[PDB]
Design a protein around this ligand. Sequence first.
Ligand SMILES: [Mg+2]
Ligand SMILES: [Mg+2]
Ligand SMILES: [Mg+2]
Ligand SMILES: [Mg+2]
Ligand SMILES: [Mg+2]
Ligand SMILES: [Mg+2]
Ligand SMILES: [Mg+2]
Ligand SMILES: [Mg+2]
Ligand SMILES: [Mg+2]
Ligand SMILES: [Mg+2]
Ligand SMILES: [Mg+2]
Ligand SMILES: [Mg+2]
Ligand SMILES: [Mg+2]
Ligand SMILES: [Mg+2]
Ligand SMILES: [Mg+2]
Ligand SMILES: [Mg+2]
Ligand SMILES: [Mg+2]
Ligand SMILES: [Mg+2]
Ligand SMILES: [Mg+2]
Ligand SMILES: [Mg+2]
Ligand SMILES: [Mg+2]
Ligand SMILES: [Mg+2]
Ligand SMILES: [Mg+2]
Lengths: 117, 70, 153
Amino acid sequence: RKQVSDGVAHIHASFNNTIVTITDRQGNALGWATAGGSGFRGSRKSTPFAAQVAAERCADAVKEYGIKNLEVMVKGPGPGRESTIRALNAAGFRITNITDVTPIPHXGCRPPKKRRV
Amino acid sequence: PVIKVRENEPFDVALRRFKRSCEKAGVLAEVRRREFYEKPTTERKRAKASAVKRHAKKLARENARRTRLY
Amino acid sequence: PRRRVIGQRKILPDPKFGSELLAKFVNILMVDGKKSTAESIVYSALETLAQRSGKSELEAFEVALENVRPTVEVKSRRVGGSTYQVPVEVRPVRRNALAMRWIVEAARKRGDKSMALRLANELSDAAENKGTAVKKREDVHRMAEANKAFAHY
RNA sequence: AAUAUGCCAC
RNA sequence: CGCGGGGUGGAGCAGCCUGGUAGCUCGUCGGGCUCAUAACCCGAAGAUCGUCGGUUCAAAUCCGGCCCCCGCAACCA
RNA sequence: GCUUGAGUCUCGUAGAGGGGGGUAGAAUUCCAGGUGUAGCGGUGAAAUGCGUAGAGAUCUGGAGGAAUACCGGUGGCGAAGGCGGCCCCCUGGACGAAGACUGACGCUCAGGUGCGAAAGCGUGGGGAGCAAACAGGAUUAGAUACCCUGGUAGUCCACGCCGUAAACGAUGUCGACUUGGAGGUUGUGCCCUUGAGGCGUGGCUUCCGGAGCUAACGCGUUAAGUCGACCGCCUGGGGAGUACGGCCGCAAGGUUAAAACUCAAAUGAAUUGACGGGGGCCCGCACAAGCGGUGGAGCAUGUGGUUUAAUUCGAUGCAACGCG
Ligand SMILES: [Mg+2]
Ligand SMILES: [Mg+2]
Ligand SMILES: [Mg+2]
Ligand SMILES: [Mg+2]
Ligand SMILES: [Mg+2]
Ligand SMILES: [Mg+2]
Ligand SMILES: [Mg+2]
Ligand SMILES: [Mg+2]
Ligand SMILES: [Mg+2]
Ligand SMILES: [Mg+2]
Ligand SMILES: [Mg+2]
Ligand SMILES: [Mg+2]
Ligand SMILES: [Mg+2]
Ligand SMILES: [Mg+2]
Ligand SMILES: [Mg+2]
Ligand SMILES: [Mg+2]
Ligand SMILES: [Mg+2]
Ligand SMILES: [Mg+2]
Ligand SMILES: [Mg+2]
Ligand SMILES: [Mg+2]
Ligand SMILES: [Mg+2]
Ligand SMILES: [Mg+2]
Ligand SMILES: [Mg+2]
């Protein structure tokens, strides 16, 4: 209902899933879409195509706010960093800022123990 | 790794420049390094091993420069 | 094989129409090396379908083939625990071979009388997307669409 | 992804 | 001794309380994969229900006893 | 007596050397709230777990603990264990230049004393994250494991105790001598700083290699080369670093340390193969792509087994079974 025009798109692409959220420039979320909600389970949930589909779905879900241009902030190391931004621009939003906001502790806590598969 | 799409900068080249900025910052290397905790003994051992292999490769390189194969 | 095949075997175009596509169709339909029988059956099916429709035999055959031809199939790749049904686009020769093979499988499994009648009916159904052949193509494309996530490879 | 074992002179 | 139960393929359990018919797992047998065995895969058979006698057109089932196996109780002096 | 060993003073130098105190930003977690919807999280797949009581995501503001990304370097310091954000206070060692000073004041070290990672123990705190134990899910024939989701001690601090580690350059400390090369780091001298250059000299440190040594692998001026001083230690394997007894400890246990029996070996380094669920490069109807079969049916034939007086003997993984 509210018109925002200038939005911010947070992509959160981990090794297993990609969450795309469109907010205003205040952090108020306007919509979201996930690779797991776009009909992908397990082996396929974490692929660039899945991230592309999720980004497209989020773009279409946030249509009535009349968003024209987007900042873009990318977080995580997952595959969904690339196809997600491609799908946003293909949807049509004017991508004006692309930022990596991946948390990098300046030490920080102790990571989980290493797997032995 | 913050970029600003400039005037008359198309999307594909903006994304390419963002890619190269992320690699220049090396963020994904640090995240894949921090995904698990590796003991200080493992850190020291693998640092020493990487240095040893680099030295061996360069010595073999500028030694085989003085070698004919065919 | 680990080397590479030479050029494909030369195929003599069939006498009635002079189409190597129809020659391949006859060969695929042939059983126990009875090309005379296969050609007679194919020719009867072609004339029957041409008479029921109105099209020229060759162009009607092309339409029936095109309604069955796939574009992307799925092949198996190994990574671990499970297999990848990777979708790969098909080359045109394999497209035609697969279309012919699916048509012939559907025709053989149909329940009519003479195989010429079966083939004419199956090709007629393919002319409006009804046969087991077009059903198989539907299955192939929807399976490839399901596995589309693996396409990047 | 799972894939344990091998006693009868030589 | 009283009271509550139980007896079902080779073993463990269901079914039975609402009488019209007995299933599950393991095991056994046959084949398969393996150099061979185990695991695994695919098919098959197996008990006529503790026992006697009734009831009923029909009893694993209901009933009465009988046999064996558990559980509670066998007290006050 | 002497000074060249040893030591002191004068000037500077580089450093995660130590102890104490403060603070900084990034991040995870939690708490309060705002937007905001049905998923999240996880895996090889999956499920346990979280979520419509509104999660995840995103934003704001707090709380608290721990560790200090980049610099970062077979770089530095330390006797070793070890020490890495920044700042301040106290403090140890090394090193260089020139001179003066003392004048063998030295080297080693049984017993002794101190320090000594991690785990652990006692008391009082603290507790974000991680995580033995534990519980659930999964895998499997089983899986009291690997994997997943949670999770307590403990990791953190103050003090005390333990006194062990593959505490390892598996190489005791000190001193002298014996071809080199490429670095790294830290001073110092000359000239020309004439372009951060060369030319020397000290200290520490990394790699290659010469003579020599070594069983070989290898070491090689930082020796495992040639010698000297002192100390520690070994005497086949297993039993056994165990038992008993002393000492230490609050306990776990540590330290000192046998024996009976038993075997004729155990062992190190290299060699040739073979093997690998090691790597690289290949090949074959090996797979993949296709066509047609067998396994089901009846029959033929051979085999095993039963049978019989006899069902003659042989072949019986592929490479026996329409085989002699
Ligand atoms: Mg994990
Ligand atoms: Mg001593
Ligand atoms: Mg400790
Ligand atoms: Mg304890
Ligand atoms: Mg404690
Ligand atoms: Mg405590
Ligand atoms: Mg806690
Ligand atoms: Mg468990
Ligand atoms: Mg765990
Ligand atoms: Mg020791
Ligand atoms: Mg050490
Ligand atoms: Mg070491
Ligand atoms: Mg030692
Ligand atoms: Mg000494
Ligand atoms: Mg040093
Ligand atoms: Mg050497
Ligand atoms: Mg020696
Ligand atoms: Mg002892
Ligand atoms: Mg003792
Ligand atoms: Mg094949
Ligand atoms: Mg048979
Ligand atoms: Mg058969
Ligand atoms: Mg015989």
